[PDB]
Amino acid sequence: TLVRPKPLLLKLLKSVGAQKDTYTMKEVLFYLGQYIMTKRLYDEKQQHIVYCSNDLLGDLFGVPSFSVKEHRKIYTMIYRNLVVV
Ligand SMILES: CN1C(=O)[C@H](Cc2ccccc2)O[C@@H](c2ccc(Br)cc2)[C@H]1c1ccc(Br)cc1
Secondary structure, three states, X not given: OEEEEOHHHHHHHXXXXXOOOOEXXXXXXXXXXXXXXXXXXEOOOOOOXXXXXXXXHHHHHOOOEEEOOOHHHHHHHHHOOEEEO
């Protein structure tokens, strides 16, 4: 499935090296995760928990924190920031 990230998500992706305007979901996640690990928004003690309050990611998703273990919720939040081609 190819997707087109909306302006805010695209900015996020490109800030960690993304270069296209169109991506597969696996690529969106790849860069999104690189973004998270690069900024280290995860919690050192509980590494599956992500803190993104007052960050671009928080703006994007609409939440102050989330768990990378809830794939359905992450997929939901991501989909709101892209149009499926
Ligand atoms: C599937 N996946 C990835 O592709 C990347 C891999 C990656 C890591 C470092 C540098 C480049 C790419 O991130 C994974 C990830 C990210 C953050 C945490 Br916390 C756990 C796992 C993980 C992931 C990406 C996005 C979300 Br939201 C949740 C998990």
